């Protein structure tokens, strides 16, 4: 009855999802790893299967990396069912095209057999959630053939994705553009929605608000986990609006091809628990809609929103919420006068480690600045070498990159047009 199959792909997918699963277990009263029913609450069935005296995360674990993801065997153990972990003969590098070549089909089918089992055990599929990085051979090199194959076999089932864009820093493999743009191509083309999380944003948040001297990758993952956990919460703990995954897709994406969403959450709390967390609704709303906390690094205080929704998690006064949200509506503005464009909902379960938390999602046209950065990497690469010179043997042909950039430009341009027309 509307259950969700979760797909984790590549190193990023697994570390991030790991953090997610621990937190979601806590909220529903399931001990992590030894998944026993310690006073289980909420609509548990959406994300966990129940066998009896056990709760099994409904997850598919994918890693092209050779051998097995012991990183799960050792860190989570019995949290994940081993029959759901898929790997092949060898791994991949940081090149998207390797995920797409050298007999990757053996693992694509094995991944799909697992998916078929998580789907067939489920009475009804309410969607898929796919978490992956955009910068490497598995995160997107394999993750995008998954995204494509899923829509081919489950055409009416919405795919909501969370994806990580690499830091503009070039410390990573310099073939990143070739990955990033092919990744966007398939996300624009096949996903129903996606949350764009930019490591630059996570990084600057960690430096500036969470007081982290030199944020490590493992710290950034906690911001992500908190966003995933809270964003997903509206699907787990029934609140004042009857939302589900399919409905979220419909409310935030008015046009095809403009489905990239920003996300923000507050208070943002790391595992150190350095500060006491109590805020009023007014303070909390002003922060979640400020530029300071936007995970896409886009400054959506200067552009305009096309659709948006806010969930308050915890006990908050309705009077204060409405005044706080009135203040927000005067501080920014919304496009094509979608009269119904902004939604507010509430749900009483407190997210742990906080008195009151807030989730904000939005479709905002400043999101294209992420896409402008990716395009910029292409324009520099191709103004110097318009040859796809990293793809002269087993890579993609120019025509594939032609497709990819064409599609990316339509996204950028349509956002710009819709905003200016209103």
């Amino acid at each position: 009855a509307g259950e969700i199959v979760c797909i984790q792909v590549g190193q990023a997918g697994n570390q991030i999802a790991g953090a997610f699963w621990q937190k979601i277990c806590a909220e529903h009263g399931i001990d992590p790893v030894n998944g026993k029913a310690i006073d289980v609450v909420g609509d548990t069935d959406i994300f966990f299967n129940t066998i009896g005296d056990k709760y099994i995360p409904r997850a598919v674990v994918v890693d092209l990396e050779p051998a097995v993801v012991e990183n799960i065997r050792e860190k989570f153990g019995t949290l994940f069912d081993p029959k759901s972990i898929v790997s092949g003969a060898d791994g991949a590098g940081n090149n998207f095209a390797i995920g797409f070549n050298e007999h990757g089909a053996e693992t694509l089918e094995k991944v799909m057999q697992v998916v078929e089992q998580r789907v067939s055990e489920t009475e009804s599929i309410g969607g898929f959630i796919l978490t992956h990085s955009c910068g490497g051979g598995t995160g997107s090199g394999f993750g995008s053939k998954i995204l494509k194959t899923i829509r081919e076999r489950y055409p009416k089932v919405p795919i909501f994705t969370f994806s990580i864009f690499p830091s503009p820093k070039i410390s990573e493999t310099v073939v990143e553009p070739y990955n990033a743009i092919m990744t966007l191509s398939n996300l624009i083309k096949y996903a129903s929605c996606s949350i764009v999380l930019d490591n630059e944003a996570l990084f600057s948040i960690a430096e500036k608000k969470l007081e982290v001297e030199n944020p490590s990758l493992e710290d950034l993952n906690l911001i992500i986990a908190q966003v995933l956990t809270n964003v997903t919460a509206s699907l787990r703990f029934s609140g004042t609006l009857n939302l589900d995954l399919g409905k979220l897709v419909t409310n935030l994406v008015p046009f095809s091809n403009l489905h990239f969403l920003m996300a923000s959450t507050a208070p943002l709390v790391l595992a150190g628990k350095e500060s006491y967390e109590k805020m009023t609704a007014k303070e909390l709303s002003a922060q979640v809609f400020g530029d300071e906390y936007i995970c896409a690094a886009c400054k959506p205080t200067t552009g305009r929103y096309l659709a948006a929704s806010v969930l308050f998690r915890g006990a908050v006064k309705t009077s204060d919420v409405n005044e706080a949200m009135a203040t927000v509506k005067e501080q920014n503005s919304f496009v094509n006068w979608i009269p119904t464009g902004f939604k507010i909902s509430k749900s009483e379960t407190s997210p742990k480690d906080s008195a009151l938390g807030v989730i904000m999602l939005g479709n905002n046209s400043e999101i294209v600045s992420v896409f402008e950065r990716i395009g910029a990497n292409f324009d520099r690469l191709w103004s110097r070498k318009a040859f796809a010179h990293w793809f002269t043997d087993s890579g993609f042909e120019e025509k594939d990159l032609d497709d990819a950039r064409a599609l990316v430009q339509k996204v950028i341009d349509d956002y710009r047009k819709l905003t200016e027309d209103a």
């Binding site: 009475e123 419909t250 409310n251 659709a307 009269p339 119904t340």
Partner: protein
């Protein structure tokens, strides 16, 4: 027979129904669970229940939804074993705020089981009078299946009367950004297929809960208390022996002067109570006045400014006929009635009462101000449709721009027809 079959479609439909059925049970002194009879049965339970040989009364109702949750929880937990278990019908995937799915997508297959099971239900009636459907307008299954079901009922049962009681998309409490699209598509279908319909606006309902009942922060569960009590008075005349309205067939004569202008607004009073003061204002004239005041009207329209096309006031309880009659003198003349419709205010009274009230009443008002409601929805429709927003969620299932345009035009013509009667 003179039996009535109720359909409840979609979440709002099913939850409002569940409350209706609890209350109707109380009125007949029939127990909630197992539908037992507390010895002494009141009224005429045959209007809404079937009589089992074991004495069980089984409500003639179908709970229908695409999402297999609301059907399950009402039929197995909120009123366990009350509803006939074969009349609980559900799909496997919900719609998602999309008329198109409920009407043309999943739902178009399901409709064969819906209609076959209805056929089994009508076949149990000695003589069926009509169907009454309760549903959200702007939802997925509500709008979509509701309209699909309505079309099929009229084709299958052309001579029975089809009423609908439905909830309009106020922007104040909405689960769907596309709600206005679904609303104009649904309203179009209703104009072409129902014989009478009652329009409740959640905006108004919110205002009532907020200010008359004194309940801060209304949630859907509060709005549904107001709905359920209003709905209980509307069909009361079919449950107890009385004058005025005594059959769905009379409703269609007194309240619908034109075959295409059958949308009714409704009022209900006293809105239970404040839990202080008194259970009801007992002055007959205060009750009579209340039914024409803006605070008891679930449409959010001041009926003072406009033209009444029809009015029927059903009073319940201890009210004296002569006092009502005197009360009406200060109402006619405050309000205007159409020059082309000789009918004045019709009223009468059934000598029973909702549990806990000395007297109460409700009114069905056919009035030109209904157009304001349609015009708010149409304004939203127009801003969104003209930029193509969200149209891809409908075209993907087969509903193109031409159907949207058709629905828009028919609803606009309805609004224009009512506007002419203001002169």
């Amino acid at each position: 027979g003179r039996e009535v079959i109720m359909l409840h479609v979609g979440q709002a439909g099913i939850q409002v129904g569940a409350m209706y059925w609890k209350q109707i049970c109380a009125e007949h002194n029939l127990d909630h669970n197992g539908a037992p009879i507390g010895g002494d049965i009141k009224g005429d339970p045959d209007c809404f229940f079937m009589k089992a040989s074991g004495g069980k009364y089984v409500p003639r109702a179908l709970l229908i939804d695409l999402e297999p949750k609301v059907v399950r929880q009402v039929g197995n937990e909120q009123l366990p074993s009350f509803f006939d278990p074969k009349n609980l019908i559900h799909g496997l995937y919900g719609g998602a705020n999309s008329f198109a799915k409920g009407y043309l997508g999943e739902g178009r297959d399901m409709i064969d089981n819906i209609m076959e099971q209805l056929k089994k239900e009508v076949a149990k009636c000695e003589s069926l009078q009509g169907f009454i459907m309760t549903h959200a307008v702007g939802g997925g299954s509500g709008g979509g299946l509701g309209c699909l079901i309505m079309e099929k009922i009229k084709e299958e049962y052309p001579k029975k009367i089809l009423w609908s009681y439905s909830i309009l998309p106020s922007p104040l409490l909405s689960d769907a950004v596309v709600e206005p699209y679904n609303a104009i598509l649904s309203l179009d279908k209703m104009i072409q297929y129902t014989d009478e319909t009652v329009v409740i606006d959640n905006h108004a309902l919110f205002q009532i809960v907020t200010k008359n009942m004194g309940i801060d922060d209304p949630i859907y569960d509060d709005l549904n208390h107001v709905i359920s009590q209003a709905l209980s008075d509307i069909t009361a005349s079919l449950r107890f022996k009385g004058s005025l309205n005594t059959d769905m067939k009379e409703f269609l004569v007194n309240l619908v002067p034109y075959p295409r202008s059958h949308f009714l607004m409704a009022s209900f009073a006293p809105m239970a109570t404040a839990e202080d003061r008194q259970y009801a204002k007992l002055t007959t004239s205060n009750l009579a006045n209340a039914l024409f005041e803006e605070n008891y009207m679930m449409a959010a329209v001041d009926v003072t400014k406009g033209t009444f096309l029809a009015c029927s006031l059903l009073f319940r309880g201890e009210n004296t006929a002569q006092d009502i009659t005197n009360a009406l003198l200060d109402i006619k003349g405050r309000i205007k009635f159409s020059s082309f419709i000789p009918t004045g205010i019709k009223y009468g009274m059934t000598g029973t009462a909702p549990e806990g009230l000395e007297r109460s009443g409700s009114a069905l008002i056919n009035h030109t101000g209904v157009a304001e409601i349609f015009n708010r929805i149409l304004a939203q429709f127009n801003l969104m449709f003209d930029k193509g927003a969200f149209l891809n969620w409908y075209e993907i299932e087969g509903m193109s721009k031409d159907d949207f345009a058709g629905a828009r035009d028919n609803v606009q013509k309805l609004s224009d027809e009512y506007k002419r009667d203001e002169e």
